[PDB]
Design an enzyme around this catalytic site. Structure first.
Site, short mmCIF file in Angstrom:
data_model
loop_
_atom_site.label_atom_id
_atom_site.label_comp_id
_atom_site.label_asym_id
_atom_site.label_seq_id
_atom_site.Cartn_x
_atom_site.Cartn_y
_atom_site.Cartn_z
CG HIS A 2 34.49 31.97 38.91
ND1 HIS A 2 35.16 31.14 39.78
CD2 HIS A 2 35.07 31.82 37.70
CE1 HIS A 2 36.10 30.48 39.11
NE2 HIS A 2 36.06 30.88 37.84
CG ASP A 40 33.24 30.49 42.31
OD1 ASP A 40 32.68 29.94 41.35
OD2 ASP A 40 34.45 30.76 42.34
CB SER A 66 39.37 30.36 37.56
OG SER A 66 38.28 29.66 36.98
#
Ligand SMILES: [Ca+2]
Length: 559
Positions: free
Chosen positions: A484, A448, A181
């Site tokens: 995600h 995601d 991320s």
């Protein structure tokens, strides 16, 4: 150097020494006994823990700023150095045992690496300004922005390596960075801006264009508003009400009906994501359970989606454009992990980003009123736009795609770099990284909703064009069904550190990476293992045997 034994309690306590940054202060230098395994963490060996801060100062907003770090150096050391990446807008200092992501229980410290972490140059407990949207408030200070973008990881890497050299009497043989991320952005930034810092880098779901996320967020918020039902306390449409969990599951089932078998095997997983994008259109797709159109022909039933819903999700997935039609971010992949049902529990890991939880009378999506929208306004727009927390959703509803997107490229006053300058990591000039032996593993879940997996693929395509033979040092592993960084109907768990070390130290490139599902109940099974394949390959079933067993699959070009 102190005349004491290396790699000992004495050598540890003597660090509290000349640091690369003269403004380094060590607050803690403590010997830690071995710690047993717990339900959530592998055992930690005996080690030295060093924590402190670099460049203590006062920002132009009047708040205190410093770059905090925590470093752990085991008494029995394998000669390797490890940095873990951050998350969100950073601001917190982890236990710094070296998380490897992928849902793994083992830490890098449990594998005898020396490990380090940072808070990125601000502190969520101190830099929490109620007039500038809370813990994103570090955006009001120009230097805190630079620290978040690149400077903090640079300073902490240098400080950690200097401590390692003093404590052990030699430098680390090899250095590794793993992040997902915001942490994946950091890993890509290091390969571009600081190529000699790390020899192996894992960048998961990398926010390498993070300043554009809030642009997508305003766009998905405005795209979904016509399908909203009800209003929040500020009179703004409830974006979370635009699709129930059952509605999203219907959409996911229609995707599977069109796309599941385009890889050869009906198994609840869309491995052939390119064929899926060419094939699926929710305005024309059938509901496979009854053959009727997914889009309702009359009134809304539990087995169809209203035309307003179909228009809204189609627009959101297409990505933001300005009034001239120029794309401002990228498009998003239709994938089955937009939903998922395990037992009675619907997957929340896709919808939490653009929609928020259905069972709420307030907006709670990340991109509507949550941290992502707040971060765009205070951290990435220049000049920053602090405002009451209650105005964020309205600000996203009123976002102008001809004017507001320009603010991530702008400078103003003391903000002398744009957010794309200090936070973006879009360069494909990885020659320096490659030529010194650096290896990079990227990965990204197809479902995601924070960052588009197709945008990571587009970066990787540009990399391959700029550097022929790039798969010799950099490979991308896309994960069908995964949300995600974790979760979703896919094989979202994997050990990325073991293949990274193999590539860096034995030249053994990853031709596949073994993965397994953390929630195999999405498929009604007790376990499912599959190979992750290097882009552009996908997993191909061999034609017989248990479809839940990795041995019956191989990586291959799409059909
Ligand atoms: Ca399939």
């Amino acid at each position: 150097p102190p005349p004491v034994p290396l790699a000992s309690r004495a050598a540890c306590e003597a660090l509290k020494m000349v640091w690369p940054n003269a403004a380094t202060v060590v607050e803690v230098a403590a010997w830690r006994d071995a710690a047993p395994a717990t339900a959530s963490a592998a055992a930690l060996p005996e080690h030295c823990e060093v924590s402190g801060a670099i460049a203590k100062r006062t920002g132009i907003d009047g708040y205190p700023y410093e770059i905090k770090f925590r470093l752990r150096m085991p008494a029995e050391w394998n000669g390797r150095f490890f940095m873990e990446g951050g998350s969100g807008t950073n601001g917190s200092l982890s236990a710094a045992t070296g998380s490897i992501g992928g849902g793994q229980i083992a830490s890098a410290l449990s594998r005898n690496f020396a490990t380090i972490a940072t808070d990125g140059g601000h502190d969520n407990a101190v830099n929490d300004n109620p007039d500038a949207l809370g813990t994103v408030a570090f955006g009001l200070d120009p230097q805190a922005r630079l620290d978040m973008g690149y400077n903090s990881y640079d300073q902490v890497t240098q400080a950690g390596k200097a401590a390692v050299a003093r404590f052990y009497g030699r430098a680390a043989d090899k250095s590794y960075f793993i992040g997902c991320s915001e942490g994946g952005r950091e890993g890509m930034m290091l390969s571009q801006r600081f190529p000699s810092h790390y020899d192996g880098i894992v960048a998961g779901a990398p926010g390498y264009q993070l300043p554009k996320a809030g642009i997508s967020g305003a766009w998905t918020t405005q795209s979904l508003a016509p399908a909203a039902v009800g209003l929040d306390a500020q009179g703004v449409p409830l974006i979370n009400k635009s699709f129930s969990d059952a509605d999203l599951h219907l959409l996911s089932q229609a995707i599977l009906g069109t796309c599941d078998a385009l890889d050869g095997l009906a198994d609840g997983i869309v491995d052939n994501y390119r064929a899926c994008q060419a094939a699926f259109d929710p305005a024309t797709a059938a509901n496979p359970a009854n053959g009727q159109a997914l889009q309702c022909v009359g009134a809304k039933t539990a087995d169809c989606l209203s035309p307003v819903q179909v228009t809204a999700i189609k627009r959101a997935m297409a990505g933001p454009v300005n009034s001239a039609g120029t794309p401002l971010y990228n498009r998003w992949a239709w994938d089955a992990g937009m939903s998922g049902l395990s037992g009675t529990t619907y997957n929340q890991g896709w919808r939490s980003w653009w929609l928020g939880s259905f069972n709420s009378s307030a907006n709670n999506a990340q991109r509507v009123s949550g941290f992502s929208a707040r971060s765009w306004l205070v951290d990435f727009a220049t000049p920053p736009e602090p405002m009451p927390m209650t105005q964020v959703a309205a600000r996203m509803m009123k976002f102008d795609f001809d004017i507001d997107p320009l603010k991530i490229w702008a400078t103003s006053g003391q903000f002398t770099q744009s957010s794309m300058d200090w936070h973006g990591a879009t360069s494909t000039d990885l020659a320096a990284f490659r030529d010194r032996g650096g290896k990079m593993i990227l990965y990204h879940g197809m479902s995601d909703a924070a960052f588009s997996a197709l945008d990571t693929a587009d970066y990787y395509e540009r990399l391959g064009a700029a550097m022929p033979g790039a798969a010799g040092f950099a490979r991308l592993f896309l994960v069908p069904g995964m949300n995600h960084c974790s979760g979703g109907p896919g094989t979202d768990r994997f050990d990325m550190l073991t293949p990274l070390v193999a590539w860096v130290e034995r030249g053994e490139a990853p031709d596949q990476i073994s993965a397994w599902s953390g929630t195999p109940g999405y498929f009604g099974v007790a376990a499912r293992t599959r190979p992750l394949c290097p882009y552009p390959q996908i997993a191909r079933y061999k034609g017989s045997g248990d479809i839940n067993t990795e041995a019956n699959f191989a990586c291959a070009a799409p059909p």
